[PDB]
Design a protein around this nucleic acid. Structure first.
Length: 171
RNA sequence: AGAAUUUGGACAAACUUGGUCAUUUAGAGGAACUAAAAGUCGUAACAAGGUUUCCGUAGGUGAACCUGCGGAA
C-alpha cells in the first residue's frame, strides 16, 4: 500500500536541498520505500514486505505544510504530538490586519504564543498550522482566535503568561 | 527788479503774569476696607501592530545573499 502527498509551489527547493535529511527516517528507521514524482509534483510512499505509513506520511505532510526538517522530525517521533490546520475565515479590515495582529511586528506575537504554550506555529497568508501537544494546541488556538476576533493585546499577553505557567505546573 | 529810506501798519512766535482740567507729590501725616500657606513621597507615566516559505523585477553585486516593489500558499 501507498500514500501520495503533493508538494506546494513554495516548499519544493527547500525540500530538494534538504531531501538528504528526509528519506533515511523513511527508509532505514521506518521501513518504507519512497519516490518523489516530479511529474505530478508529489511523493509516493509505498511499503515493502520487509502500520508505519501513516506516521511517515504525517512527517512528509508536516514538511509540505511548511514546518522545517527538525519540527517535522519532532512530529515524526514524540507520539503525543499533533498538528492543527485552520484558515482564518472567521480585504482591508478583516483580513489585511488580522494576520498582522497574529504575527505582530517582526513576528514577535506569534513567537510569544509559540514560546508560551510550547507549540510551533507556521503562518501562511491566512493558513495557520500548529504543532505540539494536545492542550498546547488548545491554548494556542484559543489565543490565535482571541486576537483574530479582537481582544486587547494586554489581555492576550497576560493570558499567554498565565497559560505558560499553568501548562508547566503539576497540580 | 534789486538795495537802504518804509508812506500809512492790519499781524506776530517766544517771555512775565491770575482763574481751569489731567498727572508726579520731594515727601510726610490721618483713619477705613480687603488680603495673608504650614504638608516626606507620586510614577515615566507616555503609542500602532505582516511572521514564515518560495517567485519575479530593480539595484548594491563574493551573481551567494540582502534591500525596495509587485505575486503564490
Amino acid at each position: 500500500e501507498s500514500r501520495k502527498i503533493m508538494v506546494p509551489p513554495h516548499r519544493m527547493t527547500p525540500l530538494r536541498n534538504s531531501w538528504t535529511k528526509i528519506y533515511p527516517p523513511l527508509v532505514e528507521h521506518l521501513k518504507l520505500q519512497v519516490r518523489m514524482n516530479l511529474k505530478t509534483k508529489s511523493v509516493e510512499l509505498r511499503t515493502n514486505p520487509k502500520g508505519a505509513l501513516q506516521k511517515g506520511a504525517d512527517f512528509i505532510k508536516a514538511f509540505t505544510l511548511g514546518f522545517d526538517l527538525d519540527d517535522s522530525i519532532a512530529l515524526l517521533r514524540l507520539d503525543d504530538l499533533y498538528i492543527e490546520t485552520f484558515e482564518v475565515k472567521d480585504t482591508g479590515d478583516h483580513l489585511s490586519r488580522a494576520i498582522g495582529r497574529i504575527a505582530g511586528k517582526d513576528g514577535k506575537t506569534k513567537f510569544a504564543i509559540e514560546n508560551a504554550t510550547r507549540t510551533r506555529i507556521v503562518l501562511a497568508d491566512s493558513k495557520i498550522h500548529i504543532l505540539g501537544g494536545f492542550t498546547h494546541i488548545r491554548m494556542a488556538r484559543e489565543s490565535v482566535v482571541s486576537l483574530i476576533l479582537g481582544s486587547p493585546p494586554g489581555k492576550v499577553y497576560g493570558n499567554l503568561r498565565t497559560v505558560a505557567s499553568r501548562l508547566k505546573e503539576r497540580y
